[PDB]
Structures are given as C-alpha cells and as structure tokens.
Write a protein that binds this ligand. Sequence first.
Ligand SMILES: Nc1ncnc2c1ncn2[C@@H]1O[C@H](COP(=O)(O)OP(=O)(O)O)[C@@H](O)[C@H]1O
Length: 294
Amino acid sequence: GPYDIGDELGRGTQGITYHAVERSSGDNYAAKIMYGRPELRPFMLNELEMMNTFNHKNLIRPYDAYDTDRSVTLIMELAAGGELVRDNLLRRDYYTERDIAHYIRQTLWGLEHMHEMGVGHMGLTIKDLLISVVGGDIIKVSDFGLSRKINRHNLSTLDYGMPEFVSPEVVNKEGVNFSHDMWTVGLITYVLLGGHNPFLGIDDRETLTKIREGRWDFKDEIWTHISDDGRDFISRLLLYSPEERMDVKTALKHPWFFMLDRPVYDHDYQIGTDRLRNYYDHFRDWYANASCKN
Ligand SMILES: Nc1ncnc2c1ncn2[C@@H]1O[C@H](COP(=O)(O)OP(=O)(O)O)[C@@H](O)[C@H]1O
C-alpha cells in the first residue's frame, strides 16, 4: 500500500479528506475518500477528470486514484496551509481589504484558466479556497465535483450545490452559464469582507427563497470602511440578471485590484475576524451530516 492515511483534514459533500503520506518518498498528499454511497461515484470520477484537465498554479493538481467496488479514493496535491478561512484568516485577530483582494485575484486566475477552456467550476464556496503552505498566501482552488463543460448557446440546469452559495438561476432551475461562477465570486468576496452572507435565512429553504428574490445591501457598518472600488467590484457581480455580471476577464481588470500594485500603505483599515468567525461556525455545521443538496 503506497499511502499511509492519517488525520482528517476537512469534509465536503462527496467525502472526507485526510492527510496521506506516500510511503516510498515521505511526501505529504491529501486523500479524498468518498462516502459509501454509489451515487457519489460519478462526482468523484468527474473531479478526477477535471483535475487532470487543468494545469495552473492556483488549481489543485491530481496525483493518484484507486477504488473498491463501492468507494473511490483520490490522492491529490496537499494544500499544506489548509482552508483560507478556517486555518488562516480565523487564526488572526484582523485582516485587511487588501489581503482579501490578493486572495480573490488568485481565485479569479484559477477560474480564468477553467473558463478559457470552456469549463465552469459550478460549486465555489468559502471552504474551497485553500492556502498552499503554512503561513503562506498562495491560493489553491479545489472541489471540482460539479465542474462541467459549458456551451454558452446550449445551457443546462445545475441540480446540486450548497444552498448558501448558489445563484438565482440555480434556484429558478434555469440554464447555468459561466456567470454563475462570477455570482459566487461576488458572494465569497462579500462574505470575506463583511463577515456575513447577505442571503442567509433561518434554514436552507428560506436561504433559497432569499437568493431567488436576489436583494441584498451594504447595510452593516463595516461597509463604510471598505473602499468604493471594493463595493463596486461586489456590486458588478451580485446582479440578478446573469448577463449583466462581469465576466472573469473583466473582473480581473476591475480597479479594485489596482491597490495590489502599490506599496502597502501604513493606513489600511483593520477588519476584525469576529463576524467571519460567527458565519464560519454556522457554515461548517451544514457539513456535519454528509450533504443536504438537491
Ligand atoms: N487538496 C487538499 N489539500 C488540503 N485540504 C483539502 C484538499 N482537498 C480537500 N481538502 C479539505 O477537505 C475539505 C472539503 O473538501 P471538498 O473539496 O469540499 O470535498 P467534497 O465536496 O468532494 O467532499 C476542504 O475544505 C479542505 O479542508
């Protein structure tokens, strides 16, 4: 057996990811082991096929795979810094808007690689942004179980996802385009800066009805301390009409990212982690019992 499976690293809707050591080298990998439900096998094979299609510094790379009759295991590149939110932002007291723009720009470079070859990610959430080394700042995007080739002139519905991060076209059961990923980028950015999800309802059903209606605002006081460009970036992505949203290349040209090409001023506003901490605690609980998708 080539891999020594160690501690749980995280969990998702298709399985649990563990630390794995390749015996013959001592190198560390991540082992994703699917839950023992045979209907998950197509998603695991999709993830494998997708990961073998990409080759980009901001997308997790595949390594090995094997299976039993029931269950598939995927061995993949280990993001050794763990999850951006759980393992990096939430071990600090404060972060800045400039930090978040640095992470989001890298997320967009990974997405742009995917979009350029005709593939939508389809399932981006705050847990899918990983950091490659302990204490580092290089983003790795993961979880391609739902990723798919998109024909912009022959759209299909998306029937799966985490309710707090889907788009209105998903809730209304309409065809889903690349602009769905862009909606999710706007929502992740809103969550990372403001520390709350503007569509969160009391339960999954209510969250979905809030997304379906599509209304949100910058009411919390934190937003008065976020730059105009940052609020503008979000507001060009969280648009109900999918065709009005910025595409990935336009998003990458947005002036919000101009601050990354200038010296880190000694006057960046310091955003406390308490709000994000509270939302993450809620978000994490959704994964306590496998998955509640469909
Ligand atoms: N390559 C990886 N490196 C480090 N941790 C990972 C990796 N892949 C997954 N994880 C951990 O597992 C968590 C959930 O995995 P996810 O991609 O949502 O799997 P699935 O949805 O297929 O069950 C991630 O948020 C992360 O903590």
